[PDB]
Structure formats: structure tokens, C-alpha cells
Amino acid sequence: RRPWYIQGAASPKDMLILVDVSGSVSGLTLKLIRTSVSEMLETLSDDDFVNVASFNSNAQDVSCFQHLVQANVRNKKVLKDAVNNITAKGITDYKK
Amino acid sequence: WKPFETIILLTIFANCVALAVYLPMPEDDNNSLNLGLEKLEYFFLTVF
Ligand SMILES: [Ca+2]
């Protein structure tokens, strides 16, 4: 997980995290999803571009970004703050 | 006066089985089977 290892292990990414916030993820699995998304964000650098989206019968962004962003310290902090606010309610729809 | 009671017994057993295979889900979530069983509830309701 060190910056140099992650840099030398692959090339820059265009990551898009798609989080399931349907009703059935309510409980322990939602909390684990939040922690896992934060940990995955912890592995990205300034050459990588990331955005986090959620879907429950309708897909939308979790924050005020709406497209891929530079994934520097500030943008990652905004994404983490937005992710630690999602609630589980609705019906799953993978196609949307 | 026909053996029409046995048909109702069998349809009651079918209704019980339909109730048993229903899977409760949290926070207004559903699956395909639950949607299918909801429509089937009209078949039992009209027969009864
Ligand atoms: Ca689900």
C-alpha cells in the first residue's frame, strides 16, 4: 500500500466505484462497504482519476463532482465524506 | 356435495407453500420471486 509500490506496480487508472445502496445492503454490509470504499480510495494517487457513484433503482453520484476528478488529497477527502453518508433504501437495478 | 373439498384443501396447501417460500427483505427491497408471488395472491383470493 505504499505510494512507491503502487506507482511501480501498475499504470495510471480511470477508476469508477459503483456502490450498491439498495435496501438489502442495510446493516453490517453497508458499514463494511463504506470502510472498503475508503480503503480503496486510500490506494489512489494524483495520476489516477476517480469518481464514486451509487444506485438503487436509480443511479446518481454520491457528491458534487459528477465526473472523474484528479483524486488528489482534497478530492479524495470529499469523496470519503460523501461516502460516509449513504443509506440503504430501495430496489436493486444493475442495468441502470 | 362433490369431492370439491379436496380441491380446496390442495389449494390451501398451495397457498401455505407460497407463503413459506416468500423471502422477507429489508428496506423495501424485493426479488423476482417475491414479485411473482404477489401476483399469485390474486389467484388464491379469487378462488377463495
Ligand atoms: Ca439488493
From Swiss-Prot, chain A:
What is the similarity comment for this entry?
Belongs to the calcium channel subunit alpha-2/delta family.
Chain sites annotated for binding a divalent metal cation: 20, 22, 24
The entry's function note states: The alpha-2/delta subunit of voltage-dependent calcium channels regulates calcium current density and activation/inactivation kinetics of the calcium channel. Plays an important role in excitation-contraction coupling.
Q: What is the protein named? A: Voltage-dependent calcium channel subunit alpha-2/delta-1
Where on this protein are sugars attached? 85
Compartment list: Membrane; Cell membrane
Maturation and modification: Proteolytically processed into subunits alpha-2-1 and delta-1 that are disulfide-linked.
Q: What more does the record tell us?
A: Binds gabapentin, an antiepileptic drug.
Top-rank taxon of the source lineage equals: Eukaryota
What remark about domains does the record contain?
The MIDAS-like motif in the VWFA domain binds divalent metal cations and is required to promote trafficking of the alpha-1 (CACNA1) subunit to the plasma membrane by an integrin-like switch.
* UniProt note on tissues of expression: Skeletal muscle.
- As annotated in the record, motif MIDAS-like motif runs over 20-24
Curated annotation (Swiss-Prot), chain B:
Record topological domains on the Extracellular side: 22-36
Q: Which residues cross the membrane?
A: 3-21
Its annotated compartments are:
Cell membrane, Sarcolemma, T-tubule
Recorded family membership: Belongs to the calcium channel alpha-1 subunit (TC 1.A.1.11) family. CACNA1S subfamily.
Summary of the function given for this chain in its UniProt record: Pore-forming, alpha-1S subunit of the voltage-gated calcium channel that gives rise to L-type calcium currents in skeletal muscle. Calcium channels containing the alpha-1S subunit play an important role in excitation-contraction coupling in skeletal muscle via their interaction with RYR1, which triggers Ca(2+) release from the sarcplasmic reticulum and ultimately results in muscle contraction. Long-lasting (L-type) calcium channels belong to the 'high-voltage activated' (HVA) group.
Oligomer status and interactors: Component of a calcium channel complex consisting of a pore-forming alpha subunit (CACNA1S) and the ancillary subunits CACNB1 or CACNB2, CACNG1 and CACNA2D1. The channel complex contains alpha, beta, gamma and delta subunits in a 1:1:1:1 ratio, i.e. it contains either CACNB1 or CACNB2. CACNA1S channel activity is modulated by the auxiliary subunits (CACNB1 or CACNB2, CACNG1 and CACNA2D1). Interacts with DYSF and JSRP1. Interacts with RYR1. Interacts with STAC, STAC2 and STAC3 (via their SH3 domains). Interaction with STAC3 promotes expression at the cell membrane.
- Name of the featured protein: Voltage-dependent L-type calcium channel subunit alpha-1S
Origin species: Oryctolagus cuniculus
